[PDB]
Design a protein around this nucleic acid. Structure first.
Ligand SMILES: [Mg+2]
Ligand SMILES: [Mg+2]
Ligand SMILES: [Mg+2]
Ligand SMILES: [Mg+2]
Ligand SMILES: [Mg+2]
Ligand SMILES: [Mg+2]
Ligand SMILES: [Mg+2]
Ligand SMILES: [Mg+2]
Ligand SMILES: [Mg+2]
Ligand SMILES: [Mg+2]
Ligand SMILES: [Mg+2]
Ligand SMILES: [Mg+2]
Ligand SMILES: [Mg+2]
Ligand SMILES: [Mg+2]
Ligand SMILES: [Mg+2]
Ligand SMILES: [Mg+2]
Ligand SMILES: [Mg+2]
Ligand SMILES: [Mg+2]
Ligand SMILES: [Mg+2]
Ligand SMILES: [Mg+2]
Ligand SMILES: [Mg+2]
Ligand SMILES: [Mg+2]
Ligand SMILES: [Mg+2]
Ligand SMILES: [Mg+2]
Ligand SMILES: [Mg+2]
Ligand SMILES: [Mg+2]
Ligand SMILES: [Mg+2]
Ligand SMILES: [Mg+2]
Ligand SMILES: [Mg+2]
Ligand SMILES: [Mg+2]
Ligand SMILES: [Mg+2]
Ligand SMILES: [Mg+2]
Ligand SMILES: [Mg+2]
Lengths: 122, 114, 209, 120, 56, 5
RNA sequence: GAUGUCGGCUCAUCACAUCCUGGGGCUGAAGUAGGUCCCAAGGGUAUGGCUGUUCGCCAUUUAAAGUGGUACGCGAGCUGGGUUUAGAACGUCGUGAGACAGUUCGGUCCCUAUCUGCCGUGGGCGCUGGAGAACUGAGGGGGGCUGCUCCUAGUACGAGAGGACCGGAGUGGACGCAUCACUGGUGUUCGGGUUGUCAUGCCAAUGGCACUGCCCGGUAGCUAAAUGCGGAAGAGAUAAGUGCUGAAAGCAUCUAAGCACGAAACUUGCCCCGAGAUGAGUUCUCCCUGACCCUUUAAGGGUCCUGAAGGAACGUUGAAGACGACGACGUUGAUAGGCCGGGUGUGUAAGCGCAGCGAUGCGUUGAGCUAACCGGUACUAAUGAACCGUGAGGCUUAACCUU
RNA sequence: AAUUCCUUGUCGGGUAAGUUCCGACCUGCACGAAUGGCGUAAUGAUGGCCAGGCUGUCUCCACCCGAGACUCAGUGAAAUU
RNA sequence: CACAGGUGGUCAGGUAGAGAAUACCAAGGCGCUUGAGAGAACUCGGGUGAAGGAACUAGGCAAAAUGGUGCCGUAACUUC
RNA sequence: AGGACCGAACCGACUAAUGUUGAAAAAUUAGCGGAUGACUUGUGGCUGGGGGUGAAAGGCCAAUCAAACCGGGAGAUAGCU
């Protein structure tokens, strides 16, 4: 469950360290963004000489959440923190060339094949 | 509730091994990637177990690639193929939620040498 | 189409080879005996009245006992009626089992919902609560305004207000029939249904189709 | 809501409620018949009767358990020495409640609660 | 918060129409003691269902 | 007592 | 001899001069996407930064973030930031007291609801013998939103770029209903750890108090963040509109006669209430088959005998409940408690022994304890009765059964 | 600016977005030198603004423990009319 | 008013504590002059909370949070 | 040493909630300020109404203050209701 003002870590090497969600896209009065949901974010902290800079407004896909993900059999997968992967604003493609930490299988879609291929785990 | 008991009983797994909280358990879970089926291992520390007959479940915690992960396995679900106890831990509590605040040396669990 | 009267045994989980978990409500549908048949010439509509279960004969009233004796049936928990279609026909004393739904994929389940008693507007109508701080005085979850001053000078009919919640007839539509087990008089339907465990339940084929 | 809940609050807090029944339980054991309000008598069954069952088998651990729930060695001795042996054959239902009208002071409904084997 | 007109004798009477008390339907008689008592209640001298449950 | 200046 | 302001909050309701969705006519309408006009009010019709602000600007969304009425809706519902009491200061005006839709800092928001209205829930009586059930449905209410992806099809169209109508499928947002099987919350009524102190003679072991002393977990129940379902198809009559045939008016003409099509509007379809529907309905069972007496001799009154079906009361109670009500049960009995077994939760009790100087560890031992849960069991309490309710049910006419 | 009407002046900083805030400019409607001017360490239940921590303030409320509300018995008001 | 108000001196036990704070107690004195049930909305006083963490609001109002001893260490600006 | 520091008694009254026919005609609860001083407090005394007193709010002078209270002029006057 990611809302506005939620702080998320960055699971890619795009240069951003943590970001602020400023809008949950995909509907009207939509308030929760789970794993695999595109969110509009603003970079709050970034490393120097990165490909993104503080204050940039982009969009990202949630890949890990504390609330976890529900499986068809009822099993739940949870993570110690919330993470997201920054995506190009126009083409919605990942900016970083690597993915950090485990990834969840709800991203098994045509547009997120890049993330899974680079995912260290599943 | 005799009817409910019988309905659940006929679909309970009989090969479930005996394990306790603090035990390092490796679980084989069926995973499908396209048409082909596959097995992947999720090894971690059992931090919580609920016994509810067919609805029994247990929580396994592990640190993968620097990120802590917790999986709540439905023990009787066909998705989980097998359960194996790699190590036996000695703890005084049924639930080990306090391990969420610890890592590295502080998260060590003493082995149970009965 | 005709339905049957069952009892809510409870809720249960059904596993499948593919690894999916199906939440199912277990409904016990014993033999439904036809106690009376309604005819157009005599009653003005076509329907069958059926009874299910059994009750102690000591507490059966004389007029109730006489009605069951007419159809040669043992007194049940109660009496329910089902409307008949054009081709349907039944006879007094006939027994209908859970196999009727063997060829049915979706069903309609109706029953009395759990009684919440006197409920406030927040619970009953999902009214938004007012500020818990910032000067609020004894108005944290009160309904608030209920009118528009002199022009109407009244409260309109149907205004949402606190009152009795639940304990009323409720119908849930298009519930999948996971399994029909005739040998034990059981009917497993995906999802939850109104009422607490052991409450009377009426199951009909899905009218919505 | 109060669905499938047990235990009367009796317009008291948990600490006061627990202490009151501890005293009342000892009174019923000390005096085999006592007079109290009907709702209080109904709750007293769920406290005194388990003590009698606990006294069915005599042991140091059981006596200490009885002491922790009564905090009066006189009652503990009474339960294990007399009440326990007397109710050795009864499968529950060690107490009986009889209604005795209403209290004059506040019109509260009153009822006697007594051990079933008070006959002498 | 307060009335704009004085309610009448009539309005007071109708409100009190539901205030009437109901007398006890009947008093049970002990099988042996023979005196009247409330049903499911002991008698004056401690009898109930024919047994002297209370000594006094 | 409210006021309307 | 008082009708309390702006804005916010909560809760709304109506209009249609329609913002989105729906149906159309023109288009300087190729397609996609627009422009303009007509019909349409069923549903839906952003979160934030700044500001007391409405407004407005800006950021990012959305199918769209409609315009208005309702005392510029709503303070006996909340707020009191702005204006508009008394304090104080700035600029400014005045010799001065003081003044300023100039600006600054601070500054008591009372009311237990009689009536109307509304949301719930009962009592009485009626419905023409009484009683127990199941119904018909006049009428009324609820519900009516919509995105994206895929196929059709890279087809129609277009030089290209670009890119469909019409029909299908899948999966979402918001909203609504139900429920706890699952994932979780709560769980001061279940276990365990621990600080200070007091007490049970003391050790050991326990209890009281300190917010449940502070904490860690947790049964049932309730519950959402949890997981099931819902909006519709179809039908009838239509709006704008498009037509067929066709005269008045030899032609033409959708219209005058006569036919056809046509939208989230309308009447139905789906869900709930519903015979106080006084127009009080229908169907099926159950119960009552005695004496007399009086005159104001009539739907008359009264005594005796009788007390049915059924109801109520009382008692044990409920996943029913403010109280009523409603459901279960009362010995020919599992209604509640206890009891027995089991399952849960907590996590190896106490006692004793063994190691250690000791704290402590180990064995007995996954032990002990275990609330509301599950399957059982008359051990306790649900009494033999009393009480209410009667004794064949008006007149008139019609059609039958008849003598 | 406790002073600026025009005015949310203009530029810069902070924010994804700042009528407030900070820095600067001077076009001071209508600052100004003991009815004191400009600075100032420390101090302030003082005014404005930002950040970390923190959380039911909020998204969006859920459950629980108590005192009322509700029922019974006793006593028994009030404004208003 | 048998009113949660106001009213100056003197006496000053135990354990923990720096303490006349605070907690539990001694001597001593009390349970506050309506009770009994129920366990609805709502109000009051509190406890807990998934994910987020000021998005609330005129304003972080209120809550939450920090909290003690030693020792290490501690910037600008300073009238030192 | 200190109108020094932290903090009870003690003296104050910044915030919130409750209460507002209140328990109370100004309080309660949780926080809050000072707490060796321009401190606080007991008993007694002095200042009297166009006067007192006032670290100055037109504050206070017996629940009354832009001129106290009591009695009198007095049946002031009222083109008003
Ligand atoms: Mg107030
Ligand atoms: Mg409040
Ligand atoms: Mg009003
Ligand atoms: Mg009118
Ligand atoms: Mg009480
Ligand atoms: Mg306590
Ligand atoms: Mg007037
Ligand atoms: Mg319609
Ligand atoms: Mg706005
Ligand atoms: Mg207005
Ligand atoms: Mg103000
Ligand atoms: Mg002034
Ligand atoms: Mg003015
Ligand atoms: Mg000891
Ligand atoms: Mg801010
Ligand atoms: Mg400036
Ligand atoms: Mg000046
Ligand atoms: Mg000061
Ligand atoms: Mg009373
Ligand atoms: Mg008193
Ligand atoms: Mg003290
Ligand atoms: Mg309560
Ligand atoms: Mg939380
Ligand atoms: Mg806001
Ligand atoms: Mg605060
Ligand atoms: Mg606090
Ligand atoms: Mg000092
Ligand atoms: Mg105070
Ligand atoms: Mg101090
Ligand atoms: Mg002044
Ligand atoms: Mg005074
Ligand atoms: Mg004169
Ligand atoms: Mg005069």
């Amino acid at each position: 469950m990611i809302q506005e003002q939620t702080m998320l870590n960055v699971a890619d090497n795009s240069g951003a360290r943590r970001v602020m969600c400023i809008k949950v896209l995909g509907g009207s009065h939509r308030r929760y963004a789970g794993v695999g949901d595109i969110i509009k974010i603003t970079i709050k902290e970034a490393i120097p000489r990165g490909k993104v800079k503080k204050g940039d407004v982009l969009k990202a896909v949630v890949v890990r959440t504390k609330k976890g993900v529900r499986r068809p059999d009822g099993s739940v997968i949870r993570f110690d923190g919330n993470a997201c992967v920054l995506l190009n604003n126009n083409s919605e493609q990942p900016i970083g060339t690597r993915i950090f930490g485990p990834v969840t299988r709800e991203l098994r879609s045509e547009k997120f094949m890049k993330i899974i291929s680079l995912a260290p785990e599943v | 509730s005799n009817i409910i008991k019988q309905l659940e009983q006929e679909q309970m797994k009989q090969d479930v091994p005996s394990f306790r909280p603090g035990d390092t358990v490796e679980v084989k879970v069926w995973v499908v990637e396209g048409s082909k089926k596959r097995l992947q291992a999720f090894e971690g520390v059992v931090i919580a177990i609920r016994n509810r007959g067919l609805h029994s479940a247990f929580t396994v915690r592990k640190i993968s690639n620097g990120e802590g992960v917790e999986r709540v396995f439905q023990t009787h679900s066909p998705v989980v193929d097998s359960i194996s106890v790699k190590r036996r831990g000695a703890v005084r509590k049924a639930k080990l939620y306090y391990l969420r605040e610890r890592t590295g040396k502080a998260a060590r669990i003493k082995e149970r040498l009965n | 189409m005709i339905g049957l009267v069952g009892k809510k045994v409870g809720m249960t989980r059904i596993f499948t080879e593919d690894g999916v978990s199906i939440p199912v409500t277990v409904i016990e549908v014993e033999a439904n005996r036809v106690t009376q048949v309604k005819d157009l010439a005599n009653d003005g509509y076509r329907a069958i009245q059926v009874t299910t279960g059994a009750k102690k004969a000591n507490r059966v009233t004389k007029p109730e006992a006489g009605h069951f004796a007419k159809a040669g049936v043992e007194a049940g928990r109660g009496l329910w009626e089902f409307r008949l279609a054009e081709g349907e026909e039944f006879t007094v004393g006939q027994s209908i089992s859970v196999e009727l739904f063997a060829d049915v994929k979706k069903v309609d389940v109706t029953g009395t919902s759990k009684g919440k008693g006197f409920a406030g507007t927040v619970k009953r109508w999902n009214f938004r609560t007012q500020d818990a701080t910032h000067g609020n005085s004894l108005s944290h979850r009160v309904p608030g305004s209920i009118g528009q001053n002199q022009t109407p000078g009244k409260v309109f009919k149907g205004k949402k207000m606190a009152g009795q919640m639940g304990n009323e007839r409720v119908t849930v539509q298009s519930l999948d029939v996971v399994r029909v087990d005739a040998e034990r008089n059981l009917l497993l339907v995906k999802g939850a249904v109104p009422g607490a465990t052991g409450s009377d339940l009426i199951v009909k084929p899905a009218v919505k189709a | 809501m109060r669905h499938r809940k047990s235990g009367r609050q009796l317009n008291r807090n948990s600490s006061h409620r627990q202490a009151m029944f501890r005293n009342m339980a000892g009174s019923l054991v000390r005096h085999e018949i006592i007079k109290t309000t009907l709702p209080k008598a109904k709750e007293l069954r769920r406290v005194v009767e388990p003590l009698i069952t606990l006294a069915k088998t005599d042991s140091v651990a059981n006596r200490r358990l009885a002491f922790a729930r009564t905090r009066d060695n006189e009652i503990v001795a009474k339960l294990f020495n007399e009440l326990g042996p007397r109710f050795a054959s009864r499968a529950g239902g060690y107490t009986r409640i009889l209604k005795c009208g209403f209290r004059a002071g506040d019109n509260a409904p009153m009822a006697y609660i007594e051990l079933v084997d008070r006959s002498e | 918060a307060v009335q704009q007109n004085k309610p009448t004798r009539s309005k007071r009477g109708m409100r009190r129409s539901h205030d009437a008390l109901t007398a006890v339907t009947s008093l049970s008689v002990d099988k042996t003691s023979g005196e009247k008592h409330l049903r499911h209640h002991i008698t004056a001298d401690g009898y109930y269902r024919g047994r002297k449950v209370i000594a006094k | 007592m409210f006021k309307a200046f």
